[PDB]
Amino acid sequence: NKVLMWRLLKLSRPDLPLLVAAFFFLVLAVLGETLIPHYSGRVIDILGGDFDPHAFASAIFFMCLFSFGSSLSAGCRGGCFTYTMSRINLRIREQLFSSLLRQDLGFFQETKTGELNSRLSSDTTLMSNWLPLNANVLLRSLVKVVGLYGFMLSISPRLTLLSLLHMPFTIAAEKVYNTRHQEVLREIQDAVARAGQVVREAVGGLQTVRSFGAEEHEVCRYKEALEQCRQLYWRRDLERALYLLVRRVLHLGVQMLMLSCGLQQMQDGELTQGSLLSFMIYQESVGSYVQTLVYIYGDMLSNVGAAEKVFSYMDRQPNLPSPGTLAPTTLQGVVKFQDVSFAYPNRPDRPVLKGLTFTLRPGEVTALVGPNGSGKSTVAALLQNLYQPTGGQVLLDEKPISQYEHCYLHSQVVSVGQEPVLFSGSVRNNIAYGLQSCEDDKVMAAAQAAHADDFIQEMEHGIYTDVGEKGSQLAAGQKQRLAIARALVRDPRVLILDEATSALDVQCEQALQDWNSRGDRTVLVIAHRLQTVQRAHQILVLQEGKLQ
Amino acid sequence: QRVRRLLPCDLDIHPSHRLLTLMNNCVCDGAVWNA
Amino acid sequence: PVRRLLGCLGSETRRLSLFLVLVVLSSLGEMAIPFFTGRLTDRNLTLMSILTIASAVLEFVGDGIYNNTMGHVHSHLQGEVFGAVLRQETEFFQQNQTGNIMSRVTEDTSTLSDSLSENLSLFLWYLVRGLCLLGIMLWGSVSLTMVTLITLPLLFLLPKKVGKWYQLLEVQVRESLAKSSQVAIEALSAMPTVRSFANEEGEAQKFREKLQEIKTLNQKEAVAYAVNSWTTSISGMLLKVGILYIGGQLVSGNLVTFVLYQMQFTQAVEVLLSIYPRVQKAVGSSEKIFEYLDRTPRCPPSGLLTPLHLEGLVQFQDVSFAYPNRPDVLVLQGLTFTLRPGEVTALVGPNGSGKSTVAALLQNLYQPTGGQLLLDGKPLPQYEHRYLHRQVAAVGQEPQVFGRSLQENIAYGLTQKPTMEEITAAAVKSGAHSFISGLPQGYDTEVDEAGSQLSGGQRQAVALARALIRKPCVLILDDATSALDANSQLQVEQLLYESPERYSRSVLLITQHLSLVEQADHILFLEGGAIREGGTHQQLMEKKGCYWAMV
Ligand SMILES: Nc1ncnc2c1ncn2[C@@H]1O[C@H](COP(=O)(O)OP(=O)(O)OP(=O)(O)O)[C@@H](O)[C@H]1O
Numbered sequence A: 001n002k003v004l005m006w007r008l009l010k011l012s013r014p015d016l017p018l019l020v021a022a023f024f025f026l027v028l029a030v031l032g033e034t035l036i037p038h039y040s041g042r043v044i045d046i047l048g049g050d051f052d053p054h055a056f057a058s059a060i061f062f063m064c065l066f067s068f069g070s071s072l073s074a075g076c077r078g079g080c081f082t083y084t085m086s087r088i089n090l091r092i093r094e095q096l097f098s099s100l101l102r103q104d105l106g107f108f109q110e111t112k113t114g115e116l117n118s119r120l121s122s123d124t125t126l127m128s129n130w131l132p133l134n135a136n137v138l139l140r141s142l143v144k145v146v147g148l149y150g151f152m153l154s155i156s157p158r159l160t161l162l163s164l165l166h167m168p169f170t171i172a173a174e175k176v177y178n179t180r181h182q183e184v185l186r187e188i189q190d191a192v193a194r195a196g197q198v199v200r201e202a203v204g205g206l207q208t209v210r211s212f213g214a215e216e217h218e219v220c221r222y223k224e225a226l227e228q229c230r231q232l233y234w235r236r237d238l239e240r241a242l243y244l245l246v247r248r249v250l251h252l253g254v255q256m257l258m259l260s261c262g263l264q265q266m267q268d269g270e271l272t273q274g275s276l277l278s279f280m281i282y283q284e285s286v287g288s289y290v291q292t293l294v295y296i297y298g299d300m301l302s303n304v305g306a307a308e309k310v311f312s313y314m315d316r317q318p319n320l321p322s323p324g325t326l327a328p329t330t331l332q333g334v335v336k337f338q339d340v341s342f343a344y345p346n347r348p349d350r351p352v353l354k355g356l357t358f359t360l361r362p363g364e365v366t367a368l369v370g371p372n373g374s375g376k377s378t379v380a381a382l383l384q385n386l387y388q389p390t391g392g393q394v395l396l397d398e399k400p401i402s403q404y405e406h407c408y409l410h411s412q413v414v415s416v417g418q419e420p421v422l423f424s425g426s427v428r429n430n431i432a433y434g435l436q437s438c439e440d441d442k443v444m445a446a447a448q449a450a451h452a453d454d455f456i457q458e459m460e461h462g463i464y465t466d467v468g469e470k471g472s473q474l475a476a477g478q479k480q481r482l483a484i485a486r487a488l489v490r491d492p493r494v495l496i497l498d499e500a501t502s503a504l505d506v507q508c509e510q511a512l513q514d515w516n517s518r519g520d521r522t523v524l525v526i527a528h529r530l531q532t533v534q535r536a537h538q539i540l541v542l543q544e545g546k547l548q
Numbered sequence B: 001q002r003v004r005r006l007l008p009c010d011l012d013i014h015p016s017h018r019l020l021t022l023m024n025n026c027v028c029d030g031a032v033w034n035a
Numbered sequence C: 001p002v003r004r005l006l007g008c009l010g011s012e013t014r015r016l017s018l019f020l021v022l023v024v025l026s027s028l029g030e031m032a033i034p035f036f037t038g039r040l041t042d043r044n045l046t047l048m049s050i051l052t053i054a055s056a057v058l059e060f061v062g063d064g065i066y067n068n069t070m071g072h073v074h075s076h077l078q079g080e081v082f083g084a085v086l087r088q089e090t091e092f093f094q095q096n097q098t099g100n101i102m103s104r105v106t107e108d109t110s111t112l113s114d115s116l117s118e119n120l121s122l123f124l125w126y127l128v129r130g131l132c133l134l135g136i137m138l139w140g141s142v143s144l145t146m147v148t149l150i151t152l153p154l155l156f157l158l159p160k161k162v163g164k165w166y167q168l169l170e171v172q173v174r175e176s177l178a179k180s181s182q183v184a185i186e187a188l189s190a191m192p193t194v195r196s197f198a199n200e201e202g203e204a205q206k207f208r209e210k211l212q213e214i215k216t217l218n219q220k221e222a223v224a225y226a227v228n229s230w231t232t233s234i235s236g237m238l239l240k241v242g243i244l245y246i247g248g249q250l251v252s253g254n255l256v257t258f259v260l261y262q263m264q265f266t267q268a269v270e271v272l273l274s275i276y277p278r279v280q281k282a283v284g285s286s287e288k289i290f291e292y293l294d295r296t297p298r299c300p301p302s303g304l305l306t307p308l309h310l311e312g313l314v315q316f317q318d319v320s321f322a323y324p325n326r327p328d329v330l331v332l333q334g335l336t337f338t339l340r341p342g343e344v345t346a347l348v349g350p351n352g353s354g355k356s357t358v359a360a361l362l363q364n365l366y367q368p369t370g371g372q373l374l375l376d377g378k379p380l381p382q383y384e385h386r387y388l389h390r391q392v393a394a395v396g397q398e399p400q401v402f403g404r405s406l407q408e409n410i411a412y413g414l415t416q417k418p419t420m421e422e423i424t425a426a427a428v429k430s431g432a433h434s435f436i437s438g439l440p441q442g443y444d445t446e447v448d449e450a451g452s453q454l455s456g457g458q459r460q461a462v463a464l465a466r467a468l469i470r471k472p473c474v475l476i477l478d479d480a481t482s483a484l485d486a487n488s489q490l491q492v493e494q495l496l497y498e499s500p501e502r503y504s505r506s507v508l509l510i511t512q513h514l515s516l517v518e519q520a521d522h523i524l525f526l527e528g529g530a531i532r533e534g535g536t537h538q539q540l541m542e543k544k545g546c547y548w549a550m551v
């Protein structure tokens, strides 16, 4: 509807200098086109009547001059319209991506990432590709139609008769067609996103597919999705063709009726043969211009009204607390729970944590153990302010965890995931991930601290060697060591080792046991079994969301 | 003479949107000038 | 180069011909109006309306046929591009990231088929209308039509000269779009890690660099558009001026009709001139998809051997391997070992010694670069793909779980849907039934992407159930020893060492821990890509004292 276009104009406002230039030129373009027929008719009649070489040359010369003047302005206008289209598209994509990252983690479980990417790719183009031709035709018809209506002075009391019996017929059909056209476009979009998700899944996890030999199954699934999209495409095209047919028939009928009425006027009215054909031209032109303008306006409305979910994502407010501000220069490292109970927001009414009251202090390693699905990982997530507790509170240094600044909290408190994920890029940019500035002297110390230098040197370009997507060019132990180095390089005060030693071999399992060597860190280790944490100062046993 | 026309009035609109007319060449921008 | 864009279209060749005959009929009907009604200044109104209505109906039918044919072509091409993409070797997907591949599959095809749909009908319509106009002009005056047709080819020289530039520009634009999509997907897929390390603004900036690289090329695109729009109009007006001059020299009263037809033929030529740059741009855009469609894979073709009975006799003969991106470094150095039915062979070694590479080689993902690997006396490529991947099953070090129902994840890849009793049996055997029955929706429970909803050992249990539902002949276990719970561990050891179904299987247990390697028939120590020691637990421990677990 018009509400979304108002937002579209709101974000299109920075491009006004291009729009005024485009309006400026197209006005010049049409004022140039309005002069060509004069000299064309002049040269035609001079060639047909008594021939004269001299008047011929002047007429053709002025025709050439005006043809230069109009053509330059037309091409010079199309260029700027095309450029502002791309500017709008890029701004829309950038703002959509900047808004997606701001969402809470619950949003990313409810929606598939492949569909998100397919929407970000396709819906913005659907939003902005119509500009270089829809706006040009609409504006040109809008300026030209005013002149033909102003020629109502030919026969005054009949163009009102045009206005009062032409509108209601056309307007209703446009509304009826648009109501279905917008819906079918929205369905086409929500089907194409679902089709793209299949390609996302098939290509992302291709090694498993090849291990199970199911390439043809995925091909069949994608072909089914493409057929589902093709049906909607055909429906939209057929309905558009039907609307075009009915529009043509209505225009022909009304023109025939007015021709009959104009003939009926000439017997006694203030009309003559010379005036009648003079009037008919203006009436035909105004009818064609208005019937093109209505169609263009309706199409422009629904194109925007089709990709509504992009606007919904753009202005969605995440389910997060207000950003923190606290950032003391010194952080003690004391963290404690207070009757913390949690249930995941995506499937609530299913308590994972019943109640926890443990406390941690610096230099005293604490081990958390429990069966599969006990709730250790959710405790680690709550410590990192990834989810908010539904009961009680999490206090760090006697302050609520949500009150610390994001860039400071995530610099002081870091963790190692159960299965870490590494981003594509150089190894030094993975170890120093998320840091504005980091010298190689710190990265090489972090590599030594994580027993990583023994294999980094063997790479193709040393520490500058590229790593494939998701870390698919390294062994599992090498990924684990890089993840450990990533947490170590940030000199954290609170370190959470969520099953970090699972993928390592016995030499590294025993060598890195002394995480409290510095003696000024609050270290939490999560272990599947009690044996590996016999050295822990404090041991917490968790089952069914309750600690022993 | 007023020779008939077999092409759309505007060349930048797809022929599917042609909107057939009765007067043909009498409808173009040349007749908007007229005099 | 243009021939590919016509080869991808030439599947139907019948609907397009019918549309062409329909548009020819419509053009004839529109041309026939004045000779029946009267040329100018007209009981006579009825037949004219009848002709107009007939033309409108014919146009509607032609448009419907053309739209349906274009939808069919779009669907076929978009399916075939993906079908050709999935055939490439596993090395190819290390050079091209998934966020680039799916951007190429989904966006390039939908742009090429949109440009083709928008341009083909326009070109045909203006071609037939220009042909009719030229046919009239031939009756107008033969010689002037001849000179106009003679000077017409001169106007094609400049677009022909500037043709390649559009292709090389569009290739860069499309590759920048693909690179941007890669960053978007990589940021969106791993959101918890991005949030944990607070690198959101870094991802935004990295996306903005690609957007800036696109914005730089878009300006040149707009400038080229403007200059082309200048040149085409200048040439179009020059065409009519250079023949008005000839008419002036010639003067003969019938020249008026011929000039009024030339001023329309010149607009048809002007439109056909603007058609060309879009054809060049479309040729440029489809560079990568028409490389995917015909790039020959490096893998050997699959055979046709499907024995009804098979035994998991797997043996290695001096196998050596090197990953394609670093061929100068040999990851494996002359391995040689044999598997037999009923025995469990444990592969043990430090991190990065090549165990998972051995597992990948056994699954025929990569071909050996030395020696030969044989299964039951036959090389792996000689077997049918589906048969080979049914008889050989494995559990990855990080098993991927697809976002669908648990009954379909366990039964993934099978040629037919198993009965519910088979899935229940497999889930009980792997121990997954201890937690599957606790889910509110049971086996119909939806699974979030990559198994994010499941716990640690539950993923390994589901992967083992998926591997066991096929009743494989060779079983590989990369990490289903550590993360498993107490019940699942007992089930795993029971199936490995005491279940009756042992004697039909050969097991390659890959694990660097002592959890289950004590009872293995053979223990192979892999250090630096080469086997160092071999033998049973007592034989291995005797020659080194406290071989491992010193503390
Ligand atoms: N795609 C690849 N391209 C190049 N080198 C690779 C690739 N994948 C692995 N490597 C290298 O090959 C060697 C063997 O890796 P592999 O994954 O086989 O180790 P692993 O013994 O299974 O390790 P772990 O026990 O830690 O899981 C390592 O040096 C690794 O960096």
Ligand SMILES: Nc1ncnc2c1ncn2[C@@H]1O[C@H](COP(=O)(O)OP(=O)(O)O)[C@@H](O)[C@H]1O
Binding pocket: A109, A344, A346, A347, A352, A371, A372, A373, A374, A375, A376, A377, A378, A379, C452, C453, C454, C455, C456
């Ligand atoms: N993102 C999520 N949304 C909803 N439920 C979840 C999510 N992640 C885990 N759960 C459920 O909550 C429980 C938390 O267990 P978890 O802490 O993951 O076990 P572990 O500590 O072994 O990783 C699990 O049983 C799981 O089924």
Ligand SMILES: [Mg+2]
Binding pocket: A475, A476, C355, C356, C357, C397
């Ligand atoms: Mg491995």
Ligand SMILES: [Mg+2]
Binding pocket: A377, A418, C455, C456
């Ligand atoms: Mg866990």
